[PDB]
């Protein structure tokens, strides 16, 4: 008895917003309230056909004509102004809490069995490891994806905002704090306890995160890129398009949300890649590789279906992984 629920759904916790980019100078970031926004321009590029050419069945005259001719595109570019070297990135984060309770569930026995399972997990230990690793992903600058690559110094400011007034302020170093090792610190433990009390349901956690990444004058920044379906018959020449808001370049919210949950260090394959993002069938698209494969028994659906139904617990780290997939949210069950 006690089959799986055909409809499961969890709304996400750790809600970010889109991060608006603005540019300015270093050692004036203590008055970085009024810095002008980074604007998305649009330049023209001329290049070559320098891709791997299918020289298996083709006319040689066509291959010679195709690579001796230029290609005349048009791209969107986002640079700093030439009198500024520091990029500012600002977003807000809400930590909701009440992670175990689904927002859609057919069964009433599977639902309260799941609630008792998550209550057992919150009973024998807090959210302390999960919140510690989320506070590590806030403390470094994972959400600065390519903007972190090749920077002199990165500084992350985190404010706890209770009313109009700031309640608690932190200040960090994203290069001293590592990209791969989950070390310890006093203020990392304080931020992790704030995030854990947000996840448990004690208070209302609102966070403002401001990141200063010194790059250089006039260098290119990297907003997230858009999708231009059904415009090849209107525009045609433009190939790259950057995401913006009302006259400011910005990164998407789901990409920062992906950056915050790169926690999974317990996937069975190896350890040379460091942490990966918490996913069902926990996978990386740049690697093209489904780590945490379902023919082994560390898949999220398998661990859920034997830790809720069959009452057999997995190891402690796999329990951390399953509660991380519940904090992530998603459309579970069968689609």
């Amino acid at each position: 008895i006690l089959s799986t629920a055909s409809v499961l759904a969890f709304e996400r916790k750790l809600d970010p917003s889109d991060a608006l980019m603005s540019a300015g100078a270093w050692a004036q970031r203590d008055a970085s309230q009024e810095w002008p926004a980074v604007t998305v321009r649009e330049k023209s590029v001329r290049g070559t056909i320098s891709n791997r050419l299918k020289t298996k069945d083709r006319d040689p005259a066509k291959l010679d004509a195709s690579i001796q001719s230029p290609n005349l595109q048009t791209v969107d570019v986002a640079n700093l102004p030439s009198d500024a070297d520091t990029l500012k990135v600002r977003f807000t984060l809400r930590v909701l809490g009440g992670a175990g309770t689904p927002s859609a569930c057919n069964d009433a026995a599977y639902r309260d069995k799941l609630l008792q399972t998550v209550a057992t997990y919150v009973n024998d230990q807090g959210f302390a490891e999960l919140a510690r690793r989320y506070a590590h992903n806030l403390a470094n600058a994972r959400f600065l994806w390519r903007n972190r690559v090749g920077a002199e110094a990165v500084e992350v400011r985190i404010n706890h905002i209770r009313q109009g007034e700031v309640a608690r302020a932190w200040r960090f170093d994203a290069l001293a704090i590592g990209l791969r090792d989950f070390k310890a610190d006093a203020e990392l433990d304080a931020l992790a306890e704030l995030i854990a009390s947000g996840l448990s349901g004690s208070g209302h956690v609102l966070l403002e995160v401001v990141a200063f990444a010194r790059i250089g004058d006039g260098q290119e920044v990297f907003p997230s890129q858009e999708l231009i379906l059904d415009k090849g018959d209107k525009k045609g020449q433009k190939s790259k398009t950057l995401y913006s808001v009302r006259d400011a370049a910005a990164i998407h919210s789901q990409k920062i949300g992906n950056a915050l949950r790169t926690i999974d260090t317990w996937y069975p394959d190896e350890d040379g890649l460091g942490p990966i993002a918490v996913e069902p069938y926990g996978s990386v698209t740049s690697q093209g590789k489904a780590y945490r494969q379902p023919k082994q028994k560390l898949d999220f659906y398998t661990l859920l279906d034997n830790w809720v139904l069959r009452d057999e617990a997995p190891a402690v780290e796999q329990q951390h992984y399953v509660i991380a997939n519940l904090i992530r949210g998603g459309v579970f069950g069968e689609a």
């Binding site: 891709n51 006319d59 066509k62 004509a65 195709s66 230029p70 090849g232 018959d233 020449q237």
Partner: protein, 79 residues
């Protein structure tokens, strides 16, 4: 049997151009992606003289004219 002749422009636009094939006594103009050969629309022609009188009759000058050409060919020809 479709022997390649030439591309219709000097420059490609967005990896897109117009290739010219000799299809028997006719002549073909395909709107092709140059890196993989995926055609998105072709049109039959017979003589290169009338093809050039059609192409130079299009409004525009250069890459705008071949933009007009690819927009003309890349829509479905009406019955």
């Amino acid at each position: 049997s479709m022997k390649f002749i030439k591309y219709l422009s000097t420059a490609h636009l967005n990896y897109m151009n117009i290739a010219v094939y000799e299809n028997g006594s006719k002549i073909k103009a395909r709107v092709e992606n140059v890196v993989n050969g995926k055609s998105v629309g072709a049109r039959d022609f017979d003589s290169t003289e009338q093809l050039e009188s059609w192409f130079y009759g299009l409004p525009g000058s250069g890459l705008g004219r071949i933009e007009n050409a690819m927009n003309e060919i890349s829509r479905r020809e009406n019955p």
